[PDB]
Structures are given as structure tokens and as C-alpha cells.
Amino acid sequence: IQEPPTNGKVLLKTTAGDIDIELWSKEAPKACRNFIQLCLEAYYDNTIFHRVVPGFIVQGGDPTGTGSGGESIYGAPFKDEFHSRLRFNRRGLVAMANAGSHDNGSQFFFTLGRADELNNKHTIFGKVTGDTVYNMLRLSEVDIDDDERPHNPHKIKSCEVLFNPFDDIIPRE
């Protein structure tokens, strides 16, 4: 009844403010490695938060902005990484989007509430710090047109890896 310590830290500089993410790199090494490397490759620069479901999630990480694009660093969608100590029991968690099993690419989402129904379906790989959760929540404070798409989506401008727990990440050219 206590969350494991985190290891790794990433700052997302967004149009809603700074969002600091602590990473569960021990529990979700593949997802955390993917995320860190994509940040370092500037892959998330100028990407929008294309999907907002009020009280549930805000989703981004698609370089096309359409909601159907994005790819991992591994050359194909990668495996799920669940852990019984990491549960969708509060808002402010960071997880991988997918459309089925073993379908992790680049798209990720923040939780705006509980999402118990996503337990054992989506990789949880991080959490937002207390002093940036208000900025995270502000990503969802948007007028939403059709298909859960904001009229004026917020964006990630740039990223900073404040602590890299991996030895051997070489960003692709």
C-alpha cells in the first residue's frame, strides 16, 4: 500500500506551463527508455494534445497530430509493462496509449481522474509532481470540438531530461 520510488525525471515545456514527470524506470524500463529517447530526439517538439476526455484523460505524443500516428524507438510497437503496485487510482499519472496488447508507440496520456478500468491494459510509466499537476490539468481546460479534439490544442514546445537513469541511450539521427 505504497508506491515504489521513481528513477528518472523529464520536464515538458508546454503551452499550459511546465510539467515535471518522475519515471518508474525500474518497473517499465522499455516505456521509460522509449520516452526519454524520443524526448532527446526532439520527437515530441511541437506536438499537440489532440484528445481530451473531461475528467478522464488528456492524450498527446503523435507527431502527425491526427491521433493515429507515432512510432517507438524500437522499429515496431513494443510490449506492455504492467505492475500491481502501479494502478490507475488517482489523477496525475502518465501512461502509454495503445489500441490493443503490445501496441506501444509514441502516444502517451495523463490521467485527469481515476481510470481503474485501464489497469492491466495500459503501461503506467510515470507520475506528475505535485507542484506541476495544475499545469497538467490545464491541458484539459479547452473547448472541445468533434471527436474529443480541442479547437485550440495545447502543445509540447520542448522537453528536458533532468535525470537519465539509462547508461546507453544514443539518440537516432
Curated annotation (Swiss-Prot):
Domain PPIase cyclophilin-type span(s) in chain numbering: 6-161
Q: Which domain of life is it from?
A: Eukaryota
Can you tell me which residues are glycosylated? N104
Enumerate the subcellular locations listed in this protein's record, separating them with semicolons.
Nucleus
Connected disease: Retinitis pigmentosa with or without skeletal anomalies: An autosomal recessive disease characterized by retinal degeneration, brachydactyly, short stature, craniofacial dysmorphism, and neurologic defects. Retinal defects are consistent with retinitis pigmentosa in most patients. Neurologic manifestations include mild-to-moderate intellectual disability and psychomotor retardation.
Quote the subunit structure annotation.
Answer: Part of the activated spliceosome B/catalytic step 1 spliceosome, one of the forms of the spliceosome which has a well-formed active site but still cannot catalyze the branching reaction and is composed at least of 52 proteins, the U2, U5 and U6 snRNAs and the pre-mRNA. Recruited during early steps of activated spliceosome B maturation, it is probably one of the first proteins released from this complex as he matures to the spliceosome C complex. Component of the minor spliceosome, which splices U12-type introns.
Protein function = As part of the spliceosome, plays a role in pre-mRNA splicing. Probable inactive PPIase with no peptidyl-prolyl cis-trans isomerase activity. As a component of the minor spliceosome, involved in the splicing of U12-type introns in pre-mRNAs.
Q: Which family does it belong to?
A: Belongs to the cyclophilin-type PPIase family.
Please report the name of this protein according to its UniProt entry.
Spliceosome-associated protein CWC27 homolog
Q: Encoded by which gene?
A: CWC27
Included range, full protein: 6 to 178 of 472
